[PDB]
Amino acid sequence: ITVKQTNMENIYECEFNDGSFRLCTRNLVPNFNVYGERLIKYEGVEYREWNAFRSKLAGAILKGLKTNPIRKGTKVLYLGAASGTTISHVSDIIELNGKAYGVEFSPRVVRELLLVAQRRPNIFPLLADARFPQSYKSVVENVDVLYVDIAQPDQTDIAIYNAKFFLKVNGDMLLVIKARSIDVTKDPKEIYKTEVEKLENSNFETIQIINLDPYDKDHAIVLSKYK
RNA sequence: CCACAGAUCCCACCCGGGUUGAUGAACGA
RNA sequence: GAGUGGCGAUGAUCUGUACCCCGGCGGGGUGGGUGUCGAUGGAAGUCUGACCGGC
């Protein structure tokens, strides 16, 4: 075993007893895991193993995401927080300084998000519909990163709408494009092109476009900058 | 010896089972 | 001149030589099994489908 820093703040890799390499984050709440993930101690510091198959952000990293705009003390608005798998990892990355506002409109699921956000001062859960930022306007601030993973046909439009509400100028947006929930009939690759055009036809400046394959089928993630 | 009975067996329908479980399957608030 | 303090059944040794280490000893780690509990940890990991009867 060995753990060491990567190009990106508070994100680390492990050399393993066998010789595999897995991503991990520095555990903000030591002894405690959110999904079933492995806890690893090295030189008396505890890391949480970041499974790429579950977290699209880890997936994006392993698919060579240039620069990660989520770091120490970053303010992120996180649309589609779901059960808290990925958002827990951005909690770790961001540390007590930065803040993460987790928007999620499915109660059956915010149920389990609560448990994550109780243990974590970083995370401000919100049972609200991301199509109406008016209904959480009164709790959030402006932000550096708009991380958007929402299952919706008009997911791109929703994201833009939130952006002009809460995204700082020169802030970054990580937008997960879910082809099969925008249209199961269309070709995933046509969809990626047309949704990126929406961002450009607003004024987002496409920085990097990644295809999340192995890890996520018919998905892509866009990193771009709001102007 | 036949006749006729008997009940069984199916045998197939018939019904219910039954698409909201037939089966068999060794326990321990 | 008076009182105290003096081996020993009313009881020494042998083995948990742990490893080896740095300074017989100090400290160190690695060990054993054992007390606690835990983790989430690890366990063909989670039955079966042709026709069941009543008549």
C-alpha to C-alpha distance for A86 and A91, rounded to whole angstroms: 9
Burial track A81-120 (b if 16+ CB lie within 10 A, e otherwise): bbbbbbbbbbbbbbbeebbbbbbbbeeeebeebeebbebb
C-alpha to C-alpha distance for A68 and A74, rounded to whole angstroms: 11
Footprint of strand C on the protein (CB under 7 A): A 33, 36-39
Contacts 24+ apart (CB under 8 A), A10-19: A10/A71, A10/A72, A10/A92, A10/A93, A10/A94, A10/A95, A11/A50, A11/A61, A11/A68, A11/A93, A12/A47, A14/A40, A14/A42, A14/A47, A14/A49
- Return the bridge partners of A22, or none: A14
CA of A124 to C1' of C2 (A): 89
Q: Are A146 and A173 in contact (CB under 8 A)?
A: yes
C-alpha to C-alpha distance for A191 and A150, rounded to whole angstroms: 15
Report DSSP state, residue A55: -
Q: Name the burial class of residue A156, with classes exposed (0-12), middle (13-18) and buried (19+) by CB atoms within 10 angstroms of its CB.
A: buried
Residue type, A205: E
CA of A45 to C1' of C5 (A): 61
Resolution (A): 7.3
Which stretches of A120-176 are DSSP H helices? 155-166
Nucleotides of C under 7 A from a protein CB: 39-41
